[PDB]
Design a protein around this ligand. Structure first.
Ligand code: 671
Length: 164
């Protein structure tokens, strides 16, 4: 079935707990496979040690720039960027997992988890999963955000991997 992956997240050196995500490989296999491998780190690189660099309360929490560590970078298992697979899944509510981008067909490794329904991103950002467990962790992360997106705590993915 669909992969289940996890992110263990710190805020200022103390553990917040674990976010578990289902990756919808049945709808978006390529996008799901990318996130899966970046979680395990099996290609030699991935999310372990990277940060949530942009967090905006009542919107979303953005992470995954493990190359430049500032929100301009990241890369996929396929190459630096890969196409928008499809826009079949929608940004329906809190807990939606979706790809950040710099316009059409520029998916890399950056992703976000919504804390509200973000319908205006439908057709622009590829939705590829959702939060199975650990929305409390997502809310903690959200609480350390700000209007500009700058975080008030250092939010790090200390460990990540595949559960099934
Ligand atoms: N591969 C790659 C991906 C992203 C980037 C940098 N691009 C972005 O951060 N773009 C914005 C973006 O993807 N998102 C996800 C929802 C959060 C943010 C976003 C998306 C759409 C509207 C937003 C309005 C205000 C603040 C953030 C907005 C560079 C390289």
């Amino acid at each position: 079935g669909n992969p289940l992956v996890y992110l263990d997240v710190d805020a200022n050196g103390k553990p917040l707990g674990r976010v578990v995500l289902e990756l919808k490989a049945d709808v978006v296999p390529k996008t799901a496979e990318n996130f899966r491998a970046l979680c395990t780190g099996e290609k030699g690189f991935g999310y372990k040690g990277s940060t949530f660099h942009r967090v905006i309360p009542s919107f979303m929490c953005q992470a995954g720039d493990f190359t430049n560590h500032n929100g301009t970078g990241g890369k996929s298992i396929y190459g630096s960027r890969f196409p928008d697979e499809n826009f079949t899944l929608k940004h329906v509510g809190p807990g939606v997992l979706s790809m950040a981008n710099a316009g059409p067909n520029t998916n890399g490794s950056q992703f976000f988890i919504c804390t509200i329904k973000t319908d205006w991103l439908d057709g622009k950002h590829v939705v590829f999963g959702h939060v199975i467990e650990g929305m409390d962790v997502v809310k903690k992360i959200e609480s350390f955000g700000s209007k500009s997106g700058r975080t008030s705590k250092k939010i790090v993915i200390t460990d990540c991997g595949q559960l099934s």
